[PDB]
Amino acid sequence: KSRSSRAGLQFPVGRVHRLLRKGNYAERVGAGAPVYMAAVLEYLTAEILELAGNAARDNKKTRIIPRHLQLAIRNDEELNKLLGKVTIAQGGVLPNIQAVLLPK
Amino acid sequence: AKSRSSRAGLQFPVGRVHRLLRKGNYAERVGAGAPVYMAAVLEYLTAEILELAGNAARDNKKTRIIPRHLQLAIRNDEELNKLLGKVTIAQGGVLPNIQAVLLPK
Amino acid sequence: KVLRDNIQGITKPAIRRLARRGGVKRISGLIYEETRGVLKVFLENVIRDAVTYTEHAKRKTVTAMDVVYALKRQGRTLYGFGG
Amino acid sequence: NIQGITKPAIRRLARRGGVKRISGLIYEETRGVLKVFLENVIRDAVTYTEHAKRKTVTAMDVVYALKRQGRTLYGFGG
Amino acid sequence: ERKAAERVRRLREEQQRERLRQVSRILRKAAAERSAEEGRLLAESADLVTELQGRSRRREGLKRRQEEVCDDPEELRGKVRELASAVRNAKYLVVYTGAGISTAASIPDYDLSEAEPTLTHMSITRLHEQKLVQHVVSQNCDGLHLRSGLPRTAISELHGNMYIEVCTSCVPNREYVRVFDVTERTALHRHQTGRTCHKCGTQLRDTIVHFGERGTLGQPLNWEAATEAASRADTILCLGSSLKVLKKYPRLWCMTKPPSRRPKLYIVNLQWTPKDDWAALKLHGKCDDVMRLLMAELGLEIPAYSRWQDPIFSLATPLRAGEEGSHSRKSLCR
Amino acid sequence: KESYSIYVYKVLKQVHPDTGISSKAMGIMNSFVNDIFERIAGEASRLAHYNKRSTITSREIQTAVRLLLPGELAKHAVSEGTKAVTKYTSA
Amino acid sequence: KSRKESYSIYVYKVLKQVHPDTGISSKAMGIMNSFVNDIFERIAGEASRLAHYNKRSTITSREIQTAVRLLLPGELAKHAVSEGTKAVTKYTSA
Amino acid sequence: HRYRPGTVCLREIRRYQKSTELLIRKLPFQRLVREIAQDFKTDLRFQSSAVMALQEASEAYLVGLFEDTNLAAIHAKRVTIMPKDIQLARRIRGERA
Amino acid sequence: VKKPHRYRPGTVCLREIRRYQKSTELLIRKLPFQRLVREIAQDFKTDLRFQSSAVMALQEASEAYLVGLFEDTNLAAIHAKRVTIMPKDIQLARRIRGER
DNA sequence: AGAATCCCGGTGCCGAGGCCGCTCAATTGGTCGTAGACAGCTCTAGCACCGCTTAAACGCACGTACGCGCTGTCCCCCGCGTTTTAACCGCCAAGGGGATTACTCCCTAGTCTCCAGGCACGTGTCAGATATATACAAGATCCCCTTAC
DNA sequence: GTAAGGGGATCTTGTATATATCTGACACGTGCCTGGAGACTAGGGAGTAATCCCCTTGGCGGTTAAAACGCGGGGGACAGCGCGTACGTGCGTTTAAGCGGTGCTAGAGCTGTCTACGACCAATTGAGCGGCCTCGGCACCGGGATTCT
Ligand SMILES: *CCCN[C@]1(NC)O[C@@H]2[C@H](O)[C@@H](COP(=O)(O)OP(=O)(O)OC[C@H]3O[C@@H](n4cnc5c(N)ncnc54)[C@H](O)[C@@H]3O)O[C@@H]2S1
Ligand SMILES: [Zn+2]
């Protein structure tokens, strides 16, 4: 019955429609705009969660923590470009030591 | 007096700024003193830039301001350069600057 | 007629003039290719954004307003061409 | 109170940055740059706090002030 | 600093522009063309007065050296006697030459095959055949010295010749006298006559030296005997040369010698040369008249040039058949 | 208060069934979703304003996604949005 | 064709106020128009964000003042604030 | 024995690049924050979240700056960083005119 | 040797620096730049048309970008006790700037 | 050989995932006014070609100043041990001030009428562009004079 | 007696400056029409007072690990020297950018209309939000196994 179930998405559509309607973006809001919104947001969150769960599996843990999200974002090139100006709390750094500083 | 800019003692339009504020999707309602404040601030900024541009034009023995004079005025002042830090002005050039190490000894 | 290999039209003296305006006194011999690559990347990005802007409006001509919008979208605001 | 940023702390931050050896005139420069950064961010945060007619600086004021400078931060209510 | 308090640059600029424009437009007025009221206090700006006075002084000092300076015939005939006495008392004299000597042949200074040797060249030859003159250095490229009759063993044209072709493939190197010039298609670093040799099997090259080029041949421009003669000679007689180019060769003037030990130079040229201050006695006037008067003073005769007296025709190397048509100038005939 | 904890958890159990999550990670995910929503919405609003329009359709959202997301992310997001819109309209 | 709006009439009046015997060219006019539009957009966007943060539907002069303080660096901000307050006081009193 | 100078330096690099905690004490940073803020408005108050967020942002900024500084130092054929490296990094980044 | 007047290596470089820092004109010929822009554009849409002001704006932006990049490169070159600029200077400038 | 770090076993403890109950926000249904999709016309600016005159690009030679490798020193960071200190933890009090609710005046949107300010078009004359001849300001080299030998 | 180094005069070249001629763009005037100003109505946003119970600031006693201090030694920074070659300066040659016409046609821009679509409002039911719990996932402590030095 819900407009989300009419498209298969798991994200809300009424919430997105209300946020677009009272967000001071335009005079009128189309009918299919919240469906597009929810589709794109769902794709992005699903992909990020897949990569983070992979990185959590490589560390022999059953839960995801900000370290794994940071690892997933930093390792992949596309998500690294998207979240370039973003600082993640309790993230850390990618392990990297310059070769010229390594002993011979 | 009829014009709202004359009552505020400004040279910038108040009615036009009010209409632009209303038809811009910034807020549902717009107060009565906002256009006056905005016109005053914009007038102050434009006069401040224009004075330095006119001085730089007179320094070159010319009586008409061209983009080079605007660029010189903007880049030669600290705060105006900080404000317009990521702006490119067409036909403006650069400030002359040579590093000291490159000059003959 | 299709365009092919026009990056060579940006000549070495032009790069030297740009460098002199930048304050450069001595130039190596491998700088020209690096400059050409950097310029190509920059132009690719800007023109892709401008083409997207002009295609949204169901148009067939790229306008200066689209170029200005694309530049402002990358934090490179430009004055004197409208806006 | 800037001297409460000890030298081992700067060494640890440099280690996480990948630095091997550190000169002896680095600590004062680090203190100066940190002071400038904090001054700017706190100035913007206090402005945001003053507009809302409050006396307490909340985490959202810091988040907005950071976002104004292009230093977006996640995990505090963004 | 306050923005308004930072308006001291306006007073700075005002004072600077005022003083500069005032002093410029005040001192730019000539005193002789100024009135009493505007010109009474010209000397008030002492520094300005001395600066513009020195600038103008150097200006007409530089200008005054660019015009002809001549001596009246009384002084000329007074100087020629002492010059003749000096040349008679001279032991080892070398003669330097320049563009002014050939000027009497309507040759430009700083077609050319129609020129002929002048009186000065004949006087030089007659002086040389009397042991008075031993070595001659020249900078002219016309080649009138060759046509005069002066032996090539005692001359060295340091800038080449327009009537000689050279081949370097041979171990001792080869030279050939050509009646016509080879200067038609000569440029910097492009030294190729484009003509068949005699038997070498390689194309010849010209002999002209351009600015920036370093002389390497030894046949037309001998750089050993000239230096040796300039080192051994105790007197110098330059004629018709400004010496603005020859002054760049140190060994020719023997500049390493102490100033007292340097040979005495007797310049004869109209304009002013940078060696003027060290001249033993400079003469101003046409070198042709001076040489004629020198010959009259010494009693030496006047050699006469004839168009059948050119030795170039006898020494001209015959050209390979079919190669004559390449050149596009006027040949020389007896 | 409102959040996307309920939906992100659903997507998580969809992708990795035998995995849990803490609270800080969920907060970071919420901030991510809010940031992306604001970016796309603002870009679409600008697009509508430039063309002298008054409504925000799905064309605005699609062009915003093209101008914002990089690389193959844009391709896959555009495809999923078109497919979801078609399924919603037909159903 | 349609009527087009610009700020040349006001910019020229301000220029004649400051330098009474100076001119201006067309390219400089375009640069000045772009400058005014850019500053207007910046301040209006900041004020709208400030209104949304505090859950208010109205843009008043307090929002403009706060946006001016946020966006202008120094004594520029101080002088602009004083000028705006003077203008609003004169308008309200009269 | 005595490790040759350089081993413990890399050991610490690995340790602090394989970690997530904070590298500055909390009480001194709070004290510095309050003393800086007292010059904008007297009698101010703070929440713990505000000071935590300030600390996280500052540490991230300093770590990134040190990365750029190390790159600049390596470019000059050295191993140790100097104030001129910090100045060059800050000037190229645009933080200084 | 007939030695003419000749400036030492470095004088004309500083003379050119002053000449091109006192001017405002464009330093790239227009026809090759327009050809390059169209060639790049033909990989996103076929048979496109360009306004003259669009190409002028593109040229202005590109020249400003290149001048700024060369200034940063010169600073990087000076830092390493050199006078000449080399590709690694450009790479370091772009890496610190945030590009790549 | 030998310290530093990962691997395995056993325990504890609080945080993530479910379950209950409920209340506001999304869903249904219909209605009304207007935005924009589509057809059509026009006129303007973007594309294509041609001929020419000339300045900029290009190829080449020469030499010199700069970049790079090697060596020596000396000095200033790093690793280790011992003493000094203040951060962190857990506990307990107290009042400021953020957050919610109720009520009332008044400020702003909406509408109609009317006039004047600003925009499109036209015309002239003067400030800046251009050619021409001088003046001068800096660079490059030579030669004389001074000093250690 | 000899030679290396310091400084004034000079020549050259490129840039700045004074004077006249001219041309196109800036500045001022005119017609007019569309947007801003004047007057009035109604209704909801915002300001003001009151109350509470959350949260921030302050003080106190241990303890224990982190910071500060001293010392010795070795590796890295930096100066100095020699050498080779790559890059700058200038000249002669070749090419293609820039300019001024001539012409055509796609495609941008504007006008009319007419219908489908989005905003508004009253009912009403279920999806998401606040509280409580329960039990396991991960950190902690200790012995030994591998691993660079
Ligand atoms: C190594 C480069 C070679 N360049 C060149 N060959 C291509 O070498 C010569 C030579 O370098 C130079 C000729 O110099 P010059 O012979 O001294 O002629 P200059 O211009 O300096 O004038 C001489 C002076 O003598 C005066 N003068 C003119 N007419 C006179 C008469 N009839 N009598 C006496 N003096 C006379 C002139 O006023 C002039 O000042 O160019 C080639 S190029
Ligand atoms: Zn031979």
DSSP E240: S
- Nearest alpha-carbon partner for C80 in I59, G41, B60: I59
Q: Under 8 Å CB-to-CB from E107, ≥6 apart: which residues?
A: E99, E115, E142
Work out which ligand 1 atom sits closest to the CA atom of E98. Answer: 16
Catalytic sites of E, residue numbers: 159
Between CA C38 and CA C58 the distance in angstroms is 31
With beta carbons less than 8 A apart as the criterion, state whether A53 and F14 touch.
Answer: no
Q: Which nucleotide is nearest to E21 (CA to C1')?
A: K17
Resolution, Å (one decimal): 2.8
* CB of E287 sitting under 6 A from ligand 1: yes
Domains belonging to chain B, first-starting first, are: 1-105 (1.10.20.10)
Provide DSSP, H12-60. HHHHHHS--S--S-HHHHHHHHHHHHTTTSSS-EE-HHHHHHHHHHHHH
The token pair that represents G66 in the structure block = 């706060």
Between CA A86 and CA A78 the distance in angstroms is 14
**Measured in Å, how far apart are chain H's first and last C-alpha atoms?**
50
Neighbours of B59 (CB within 10 A): 12
The token pair that represents B3 in the structure block = 């014009």
Per DSSP, the three-state class of I41 is helix
Per DSSP, the three-state class of E187 is strand
With beta carbons less than 8 A apart as the criterion, state whether G77 and D43 touch.
Answer: no
Q: Name the CA dihedral angle for G26, G30, G32, G35, rounded to a multiple of 10 degrees.
A: -170
Among positive and negative, which fits the CA dihedral H66, H69, H71, H76?
A: negative
Q: Name the CA dihedral angle for B21, B23, B28, B31, rounded to a multiple of 10 degrees.
A: 30
Among positive and negative, which fits the CA dihedral B95, I58, I37, C43?
A: positive
- Nearest alpha-carbon partner for G69 in A53, H40, B46, D6: H40
Q: For A8-13, which contacts have Cβ atoms below 8 Å and span 24 or more sequence positions?
A: A8/F84, A8/F87, A9/A35, A9/A38, A9/A39, A9/A42, A9/F84, A10/A42, A10/F7, A10/F10, A10/F11, A10/F14, A11/A38, A11/A41, A11/A42, A11/F4, A11/F7, A12/A38, A12/F7, A13/A38
The token pair that represents E236 in the structure block = 């110098």
Number of residues written out for chain A: 104
CB B31 within 7 Å, strand J? yes
CA/C1' separation H49–J20 (Å): 33
Q: Under 8 Å CB-to-CB from D56, ≥6 apart: which residues?
A: D49, H45, H46, H47
Per DSSP, the three-state class of B30 is strand
Per DSSP, the three-state class of E285 is coil
Q: Where do the domains of chain F lie?
A: 22-90
Q: Judge: domain G26-93, CATH 1.10.10.10.
A: no
Q: How many CA atoms lie within 13 A of H59 on its CB side?
A: 27
Provide DSSP, H49-96. HHHHHHHHHHHHHHHHHHHHHHHHHHHTT-SEE-HHHHHHHHHHTTS-
- Nearest alpha-carbon partner for F6 in E180, H74, F18, F21: F21
The token pair that represents I74 in the structure block = 């010169």
- Nearest alpha-carbon partner for F63 in C69, A81, I53: C69
Between CA G63 and CA G52 the distance in angstroms is 11
**C-alpha distances out from residue I7 to D59, E13, E188, I4, Å:** 65, 36, 19, 10
**C-alpha distances out from residue C55 to E24, F63, F77, I61, Å:** 63, 9, 19, 22
To 10 degrees, what angle do helices G8-18 and B34-59 make? 60
| Pick among C56, C63, C66 to test the F interface (most F CBs inside 10 A) | C56
Between CA B54 and CA B65 the distance in angstroms is 7
Cβ of I100 under 8 Å from any chain H Cβ? Answer: no
SS3 content of chain E, % helix, strand, coil (to 5): 35, 10, 55
Question: Tell me, what amino acid is at E124?
Answer: I
- Pairing assessment for the beta strands E174-177 and E164-167 based on DSSP bridges: antiparallel
CA triplet A46, F14, F26: central angle to 5 degrees?
55
What's E73-314's CATH class? alpha beta
Per residue in B26-58, is it b (16+ CB within 10 Å) or e — as a string?
A: bbeebbebbbbbbbbbbbbbbbbbbbbbbbbbb
Chain I residues 32 to 61 whose Cβ lies within 7 Å of strand J are: 49-52
The token pair that represents E76 in the structure block = 């000329």
- Looking up tokens 């002896």 gives D24
Q: What's chain I's Rg over C-alpha atoms?
A: 19
Contact D78 F35 (CB under 8 A): yes
Neighbours of D76 (CB within 10 A): 21
Closest CB to B11: pick one of G13, G58, G75.
G13
- Looking up tokens 């000597």 gives E101
- Give the helix ranges, DSSP H, for chain G: 8-18, 26-53, 61-71, 75-93
Per DSSP, the three-state class of C80 is coil
Which H/E stretch holds residue E22? helix E8-27
Provide DSSP, A3-16. TTTTTT-SS-SHHH
The token pair that represents B90 in the structure block = 């067409």
Q: Judge: domain H7-92, CATH 3.40.50.11740.
A: no
Q: For D32-38, which contacts have Cβ atoms below 8 Å and span 24 or more sequence positions?
A: D33/H62, D33/H65, D33/H86, D33/H90, D34/D2, D34/D5, D34/H58, D34/H62, D35/D2, D35/H36, D37/H58, D37/H61, D38/H32, D38/H33, D38/H36, D38/H54, D38/H58
Q: For I3-12, which contacts have Cβ atoms below 8 Å and span 24 or more sequence positions?
A: I3/E211, I3/E212, I3/E248, I4/E211, I4/E212, I10/B104, I10/C25, I11/B104
**C-alpha distances out from residue H64 to A27, D27, H9, H61, I91, Å:** 43, 16, 19, 5, 18
User: D1-78: CATH homologous superfamily?
Assistant: Histone, subunit A (1.10.20.10)
Phi, psi of E156 (to 5 degrees): -155, 100
Residue A83: list chain F partners with CB under 8 A. Answer: 32
To 10 degrees, what angle do helices B34-59 and B67-75 make? 100
Q: Under 8 Å CB-to-CB from E119, ≥6 apart: which residues?
A: E104, E288, E291, E292, E302
**C-alpha distances out from residue C71 to C20, C50, E216, I31, I64, Å:** 25, 8, 62, 22, 12
Between CA I5 and CA E191 the distance in angstroms is 22
- Looking up tokens 């209303």 gives B22
Between CA C63 and CA I58 the distance in angstroms is 11
CA/C1' separation G47–K80 (Å): 64
Between CA I9 and CA I73 the distance in angstroms is 22
Between CA G54 and CA D51 the distance in angstroms is 9
Chain J nucleotides near the protein (CB, 7 A):
4-5, 15-17, 25-28, 35-36, 45-47, 56-58, 61-68, 76-80, 86-88, 96-99, 107-109, 116-121, 127-128, 135-136, 139-144
DSSP E191: -
**C-alpha distances out from residue F22 to A93, F28, F35, F36, Å:** 21, 11, 21, 22
Chain K nucleotides near the protein (CB, 7 A):
10-16, 18, 25-27, 34-38, 45-46, 55-57, 66-68, 73-78, 86-93, 96-98, 106-108, 110, 117-119, 127-130, 137-138, 149
What subunits make at least 3 CB pairs under 8 angstroms with G? B, C, D, E
Question: Tell me, what amino acid is at C73?
Answer: R
Experimental technique used to determine this entry: cryo-EM
C-alpha F32, offset from chain centre: 10
Pick the CATH number of F22-90 from 1.10.565.10, 3.90.1150.10, 1.10.20.10, 3.40.630.30: 1.10.20.10
Between CA F68 and CA F62 the distance in angstroms is 10
Residues in a beta bridge with E165: E176
The token pair that represents B74 in the structure block = 């903007």
Which H/E stretch holds residue G58? strand G58-59
To 10 degrees, what angle do helices H7-17 and D7-16 make? 80
* CB of E285 sitting under 6 A from ligand 1: no
Pick the CATH number of I11-97 from 1.10.10.60, 1.10.20.10, 1.10.3090.10, 3.40.50.2300: 1.10.20.10
What is C1-83's CATH number?
Answer: 1.10.20.10
With beta carbons less than 8 A apart as the criterion, state whether E123 and E291 touch.
Answer: yes
Between CA A89 and CA A91 the distance in angstroms is 5
Chain H residues 50 to 89 whose Cβ lies within 7 Å of strand J are: 80
With beta carbons less than 8 A apart as the criterion, state whether B56 and E13 touch.
Answer: no
Contact H18 A95 (CB under 8 A): yes
